[PDB]
Design an enzyme around this catalytic site. Structure first.
Site, PDB file in Angstrom:
ATOM      1  N   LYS A 203       9.129   3.975 -72.231  1.00 55.15           N
ATOM      2  CA  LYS A 203       7.773   3.755 -72.208  1.00 55.15           C
ATOM      3  C   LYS A 203       6.836   4.899 -71.812  1.00 55.15           C
ATOM      4  CE  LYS A 203       8.420  -1.237 -71.806  1.00 55.15           C
ATOM      5  NZ  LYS A 203       8.805  -2.295 -71.000  1.00 55.15           N
TER       6      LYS A 203
ATOM      7  N   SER B  75       5.490  -2.586 -67.124  1.00 55.15           N
ATOM      8  CA  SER B  75       6.574  -2.679 -67.959  1.00 55.15           C
ATOM      9  C   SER B  75       6.476  -3.648 -69.090  1.00 55.15           C
ATOM     10  CB  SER B  75       7.878  -2.852 -67.143  1.00 55.15           C
ATOM     11  OG  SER B  75       8.812  -1.938 -67.944  1.00 55.15           O
TER      12      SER B  75
ATOM     13  N   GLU C   9      10.741  -3.375 -78.560  1.00 55.87           N
ATOM     14  CA  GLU C   9      11.188  -4.501 -77.649  1.00 55.87           C
ATOM     15  C   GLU C   9      11.203  -5.619 -78.576  1.00 55.87           C
ATOM     16  OE1 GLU C   9      11.770  -3.770 -74.676  1.00 55.87           O
ATOM     17  OE2 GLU C   9      10.789  -1.799 -73.916  1.00 55.87           O
TER      18      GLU C   9
ATOM     19  N   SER D 161      13.226   0.474 -70.492  1.00 53.68           N
ATOM     20  CA  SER D 161      12.039   0.611 -70.333  1.00 53.68           C
ATOM     21  C   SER D 161      11.497   2.250 -69.747  1.00 53.68           C
ATOM     22  CB  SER D 161      11.487  -0.146 -69.382  1.00 53.68           C
ATOM     23  OG  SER D 161      11.317  -1.322 -69.915  1.00 53.68           O
TER      24      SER D 161
ATOM     25  N   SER E 153      15.469  -1.529 -67.055  1.00 49.21           N
ATOM     26  CA  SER E 153      16.471  -2.189 -67.059  1.00 49.21           C
ATOM     27  C   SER E 153      16.814  -3.010 -68.257  1.00 49.21           C
ATOM     28  CB  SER E 153      15.992  -3.265 -65.837  1.00 49.21           C
ATOM     29  OG  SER E 153      15.360  -4.449 -66.266  1.00 49.21           O
TER      30      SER E 153
END
Length: 261
Positions: free
Chosen positions: A46, A103, A139, A43, A210
């Site tokens: 992002k 997230s 994702e 993440s 993560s």
């Protein structure tokens, strides 16, 4: 140096692979540990998608207010904010905030779509001089973090330099940069990572990440009270696919770095 020996010892105690990059903007000095090795971003990627949309908004002045429909098919594995707006809309600003501060994975995928795919996110990295970042997937599959797989990786050195440019430099316009900083400072997911190894008086803006292989990441801009800001990237990944997250390693790495500045 002392710090590199302590980071190596932390790594050995952890059983995993640790990558650290610190930029001290006071003298542009750098501290690197596995600084040029690739790590899965998870993440932390992002930040690049949000910044790319911010860059678009420099020309499309109203872009961040553009409503984007959240449909049930859009939802992926972790959508704390998008879930709240299914069958409604979120603006690109709200999606950027959600991707960064919570997230949210659906939010990230909408940002990727706005940019024309992962290649559009990567293109923005190249445009601001980051030849290392690569976003290949959406994702949630970009978090597979398979050892040796170059997809969806960057290096600590590259990400530290890019994060510096986005937040403290002028890769973005003034209003966009300020918005990004405000978003990072409001992150909600970072309390146990870099922030936990730093004096409580320091202001931190960060983005965690993560993934599989116990991948545990955090990238941060740090404003110590009465001192030039620092950029700190900590990446950590482990040899077992089902390993648990080790945010304490990132906190410890930050503490080791903070010792000495």
């Amino acid at each position: 140096s002392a710090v590199q020996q302590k980071l190596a010892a932390l790594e050995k105690s952890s059983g995993g692979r640790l990558g650290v990059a610190l930029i001290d903007t006071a003298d542009n000095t750098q501290v690197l540990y596995r600084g040029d090795e690739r790590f899965p971003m998870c993440s932390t990627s992002k930040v690049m998608a949000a910044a790319a949309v911010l860059k678009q908004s420099e020309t499309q002045k109203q872009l961040l207010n553009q409503p984007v429909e959240i449909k049930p098919a859009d939802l992926v594995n972790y959508n704390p904010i998008a879930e709240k707006h299914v069958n409604g809309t979120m603006t690109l600003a709200e999606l950027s905030a959600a991707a960064l501060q919570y997230s949210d994975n659906t939010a990230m995928n909408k940002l990727i779509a706005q940019l024309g795919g992962p290649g559009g996110v990567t293109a923005f990295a190249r445009a601001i001089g980051d030849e290392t970042f690569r976003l290949d997937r959406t994702e949630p599959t970009l978090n597979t973090a398979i050892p040796g797989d170059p997809r969806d990786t960057t290096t600590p050195r590259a990400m530290a330099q890019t994060l510096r440019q986005l937040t403290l430099g002028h890769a973005l316009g003034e209003t966009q940069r300020a918005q990004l900083v405000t978003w990072l400072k409001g992150n909600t997911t970072g309390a146990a990572s870099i922030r936990a190894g730093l004096p409580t008086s320091w202001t931190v803006g960060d983005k965690t990440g993560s993934g599989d292989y116990g991948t545990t990441n955090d990238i941060a801009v740090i404003w110590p009270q009465g001192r030039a800001p620092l950029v700190l990237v900590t990446y950590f990944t482990q040899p077992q696919q089902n390993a648990e997250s080790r945010r304490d390693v990132l906190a410890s790495a930050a503490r080791i770095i903070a010792e000495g500045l």
